Amino acid sequence: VTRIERIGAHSHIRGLGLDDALEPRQASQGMVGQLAARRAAGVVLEMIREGKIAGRAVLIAGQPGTGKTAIAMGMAQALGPDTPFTAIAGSEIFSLEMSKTEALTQAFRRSIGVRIKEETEIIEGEVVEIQIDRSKVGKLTLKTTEMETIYDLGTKMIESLTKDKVQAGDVITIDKATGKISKLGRSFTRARDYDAMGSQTKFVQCPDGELQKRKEVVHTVSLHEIDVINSRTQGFLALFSGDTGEIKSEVREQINAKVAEWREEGKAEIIPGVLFIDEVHMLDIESFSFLNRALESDMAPVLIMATNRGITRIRGTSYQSPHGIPIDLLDRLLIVSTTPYSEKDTKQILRIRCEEEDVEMSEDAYTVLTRIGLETSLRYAIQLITAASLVCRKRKGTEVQVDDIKRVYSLFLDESRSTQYMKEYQDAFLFN
Amino acid sequence: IAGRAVLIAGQPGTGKTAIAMGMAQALGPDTPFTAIAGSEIFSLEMSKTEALTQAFRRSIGVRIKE
Amino acid sequence: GEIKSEVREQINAKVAEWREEGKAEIIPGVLFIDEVHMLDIESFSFLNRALESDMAPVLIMATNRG
Amino acid sequence: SPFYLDSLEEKRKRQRSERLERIFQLSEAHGALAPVYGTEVLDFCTLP
Amino acid sequence: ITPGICFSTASLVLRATDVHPLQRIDMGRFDLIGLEGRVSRYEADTFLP
Amino acid sequence: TQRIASHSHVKGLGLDESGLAKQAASGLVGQENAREACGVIVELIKSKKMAGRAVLLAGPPGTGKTALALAIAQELGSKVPFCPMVGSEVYSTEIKKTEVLMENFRRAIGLRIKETKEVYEGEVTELTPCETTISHVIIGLKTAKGTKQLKLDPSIFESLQKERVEAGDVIYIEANSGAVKRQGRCDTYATEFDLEAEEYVPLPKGDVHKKKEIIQDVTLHDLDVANARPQGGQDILSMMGQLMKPKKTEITDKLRGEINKVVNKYIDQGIAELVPGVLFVDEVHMLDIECFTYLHRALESSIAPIVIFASNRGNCVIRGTEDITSPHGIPLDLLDRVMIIRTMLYTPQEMKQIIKIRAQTEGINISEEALNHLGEIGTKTTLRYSVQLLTPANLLAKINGKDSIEKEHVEEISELFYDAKSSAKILADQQDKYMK
Ligand SMILES: Nc1ncnc2c1ncn2[C@@H]1O[C@H](COP(=O)(O)OP(=O)(O)O)[C@@H](O)[C@H]1O
Ligand SMILES: Nc1ncnc2c1ncn2[C@@H]1O[C@H](COP(=O)(O)OP(=O)(O)O)[C@@H](O)[C@H]1O
Ligand SMILES: Nc1ncnc2c1ncn2[C@@H]1O[C@H](COP(=O)(O)OP(=O)(O)O)[C@@H](O)[C@H]1O
Ligand SMILES: [Mg+2]
C-alpha cells in the first residue's frame, strides 16, 4: 500500500557507507563517491556518538548538487533514532512569535535528549463495591483474577473517587505515593451490553496477578520540551500548538540544574544530538553572532551546517564573506568540502535512483542520461528518470529506452534551455 | 459573469468617483456595493490578502427567504 | 483574525448546495477600490488570481496616476 | 412455547450479535491511540 | 445607557458548519491532544496490550 | 458553478489515449507540448509513489499556465486534493512564512477514510436512568416506522441532562461517541401550549437505528489543526480558552510526526487511504528568498506533495534580495529542482478558437465577421481584452434588439473601453495633467 513516507530526493540513502575504519566504500548504503567528505562525516559522527565534547560546529560546503544534504541525511540515518537529530532550514528561525535567538535556543535545546526513568508503585484492580458513610469514611473493594481485598478510605481518597465518578465494574489504577486515580476501563458483564457508548468508555479484561504492582516508565524528552512544560501552567499544550513564546532564561537555568540533579540521582540520562541547519546563508548577522557564543555552552549539541554559496554578502550587512558566514564563526567550525561528481559517479547515482524508483533502463539509456546529467545537472537527470519511466509505461513498454529519454528531454526543459528560450522572447516576459 | 474588473482612469476631478457613486445609486440596496480605499487594506489585524479576501466576500450576498 | 481557508471552502460548498437545492439565491455585487494605486505588488498579484473564482464580484477601480 | 416466534428470535439474536460486535469495535477504537507524552512523563517533567 | 444592537440573520446561516453524523467520520481516532492529562503510558504500553 | 469564471471552459488536458495533445479538445486550444507535459505530470500524480517532485510553468502572460494547472486538477478529479495558493499569500500576520508553506504542503496531502456511522434518532418516549450511581440509561425512541428501546452507557446521561432532553423531544444519539443533540420538540406536541418559545420538528421518517457507510476525504492539515488546541474540557482553564481569539499557530514538528505515525497505523489497519495530491503555487515570484530556501528543504521531504509553480517574469530581481536577478524571479538553486514546462504565445487562429470557446461558454452568439474583428483586436491588443469584450457587446446587442453580436457592437464596445496599450498612449500624451 501507499504509506505516508514515499520516494523522495534522499530515500535511497541509508547511511554513510563506511567500514569499521571509517573508510568510505565506493558504493555502499546508497552513497556514491565523495570519499573524503564521507570520511569527514563519519569522523564527526563518531564525535557525536562519544558525546564528550560540546558545541562542535561543522560546515558542509560545496557546489550545488555535490551531495551536502545527501551527506547530512546519511549522517542522520547512520545515527540512531535514539540520538536526537533536529534538521531545520535557515529560514525557519524567522518567526513572528519569538526572536531569532530564541528560535536558535529552542533548536539547540531540541537537539539534546533527556531519557527519564521513573519507577512507581501502583494499585491495580477492578472495583467491586464502593461504600461511603455519612462522606467522612468509607471502604473500597478491589479485585483481580487471583486476588481481592478491601481498603479503608479517607477524606481525600473519597473526594477523589467521587470526582472521577468511580463505580462498580471500573478497572482503575491508584498511585500509592500521590493517590491519583486514573480509569483504565470497565469490566464487561451481561448487563453492560450498551447500544451506544461514550467517547472515552472502553471494555477491558480484569487484571491478573497481584493488586500491588510496580510501574516503570522510560521515555525520551528534549530540553526544549521540559522548558515548554514548565513555561506556563499548561505548558504541555504549547508542545502541540507551538505558541511557546520566549521562555525565560531563569526557567532554562532551573531546568538545567534539575536535569543535572536527575542525572546524578540516576533518574535521567543525557543524549546530546545534532542540529542540522541547511542553507545557513539565510541566517542574518545577528543569528551568526548568537551562534558564536551559543556553541560555547556545556549543553550545546553538534551543529552541522551546509551552504553552497561562494564569497557572497552576509545577510543584514554589506560585507562579503567566503560562505556568507562571518569569518569569526568560520574559525569556530571545520569545513567539509564536496567535490563535483565524475561520469562514473553520476552513472552510479542514476543507477541507485532507478533501483530506488523501480525503473528498468537500458545501458544506452543510462549513457544518454549520464551525458544529460553532466551537461545540465544531476537533479535534472534524476527527474528525467521518472519522466521517462512514465512515458515508457504509457506506450506499454517495460524498459526505458533512449527514445523515452529524448522524449522527456524535449518535453521538460532544464534551466539553460528555458533561459535561452526566454531570451529569445525577452520582451514578452514582464520586468526584465 | 464572475470576476470582471473595470478601471476608471482620468485626470483629477473628472468624475471618476462621481461615476462610481452614480453606479452605486443606480443599483439598489439589494445588491452589495463595497466601497473601500486602497489604504484600508493595510492592517495590523490581518494580512493584505486576507483584507482583500474579506473585501471580495463582502461583495457577494446570499438571499434567504423564510 | 485571519479566517481559515477550510472554513471558507466549507462555506462555499454549503452555499453551492443551498443554491442547487433552491434554499438560497446568490446576489453578486460590486467591490469599489478608489485610489487603487495605493495597493502594492502583493495585493495586485492576489487580485490577479482572486478574480478567477466563480464567487468573485465585479471589481471597479479608480486612479488618476500616469 | 405456544406463542414462540422463530423470526422474532432470529432478529433478536442478530441484533445481539450486532450489539456485541459494536461493543468490541468501539472498545478497540477508544483505546487505540497512545499519548505523545503521557501523564507520567508530564508529572516527572513538571517542576513545582 | 443604550439598548444593544439586534443583528438579524437568516436561520440557515447558523447551520452552515453543521454536518449530520451520518455524513462525517469520527475525528476522535486522530485526537492526540485530548489524551494528555488523561491517558498514561502504563495504559497504552503495558496494560492494554 | 452557475457563474462563468475565467477558466469555466477548461474540462481537461484534451489528450488522446496515447498521451498526444489534440489541437482543440476539453476547452484547450493549442499549447500541445505543454499539454503533453502536463499529461505526463498527471500520470506522475496518479502514480502515488513519488513525493516532492516540482514543476514550473514558465511563459508570457496570458499563455495558459493557470488554465493548464486547472486542467491538471480536472484530470485528477475532486478525489485528489488540489490546493491553489498565490505566492503573496505567505505574508501572514499570525504565523511565519515557512509555517504557511508547510500548512499548504499538508493541505495538499489527502487521506481517505472509510467508516460506517450509526445514529439512533427519534422522539423520546421514555428516559429512565437505572440506579445501581446510575448503571445505565434506558431510553425510548419513536419514529414513523416503530419504537425502539435502547440501553445507553451511563456517561450519556450527563449529555442528555445538559441537552435538556425530556419526553416528546426529537433527539439523535451517536452510537460511537454518545453525543446527544436535541433538535427540537415533536410537532405532535405543538398544541400543548398556545405560546411557547419552542422549535417544533416533524417526527423522523425512517428507522430509529440508521446505518450509513461513508467515505470522507481529509487532509493532513485538518488532523494537524485538530490537535493544535484542546476541545471541550470542563476545567476553568479550558472554558476560558474558548473565549480566546482563534489564532493560527506554528504547529510543532513533533505533532506532525506523531500524526504521521497515527496515519500510518490507520493505513496499515486498512481503514485509511493516502491521496498525495497537488499544491499549485501561482505568482511564485511573490515569494521571497527565505520562502524559496525553505522550499529547497520542503521539496526534499519524503512526505511532500507534487508542487506546480507558475511564473511570467523574465530576468528580474528576487523579492527578498537587493540586486540578485534570476531567470524567472526564482533562485537558480530552486530552478535546479524543478521540471520546466514552457508555454508559447498564441497565433491569431488559436486566439479566434479561444474566443469562440469563450463565447460558447458564456452563452453568446457571435457572427463570423464579428468573430474575425474580435480576433484582429486580440492580435492588435491582447487575447484577454478580446475575451472581455464579449459580454458587453452581447449586452449592447440585446439592448438594440438583436440576439447575436454584430461587428458594429464590437466596434462600439472597442470605442467605449480602452486596453492597456491605448490607455498608456493616452497617458504618455498627457503626462503633465495626470498625477505622478
Ligand atoms: N554521493 C551521493 N550518493 C547518492 N546520491 C547523491 C550523492 N550526492 C547527491 N546525491 C543525490 O543527488 C541529489 C542532489 O544532492 P543534494 O545533496 O541534495 O545536493 P546539495 O549537496 O546541493 O544539497 C539528491 O537527490 C541526492 O540524493
Ligand atoms: N459628470 C459629473 N456630474 C456631476 N458631478 C460631477 C461630475 N464630475 C465631477 N463631479 C463632481 O465634482 C467633484 C469632484 O469629484 P470627482 O470629479 O469625482 O473627483 P475624481 O474624479 O478625481 O475622483 C465631486 O463633487 C463630483 O460629484
Ligand atoms: N490554451 C488555452 N485554451 C483555452 N483557453 C485558454 C488557453 N490559454 C489561456 N486561456 C484562457 O485565457 C485566459 C488567460 O489564461 P491564463 O491561464 O490566465 O494565463 P496565465 O498563464 O497568465 O495564467 C484564461 O481565461 C484562460 O482560461
Ligand atoms: Mg541541499
Ligand SMILES: [Mg+2]
Ligand atoms: Mg476620487
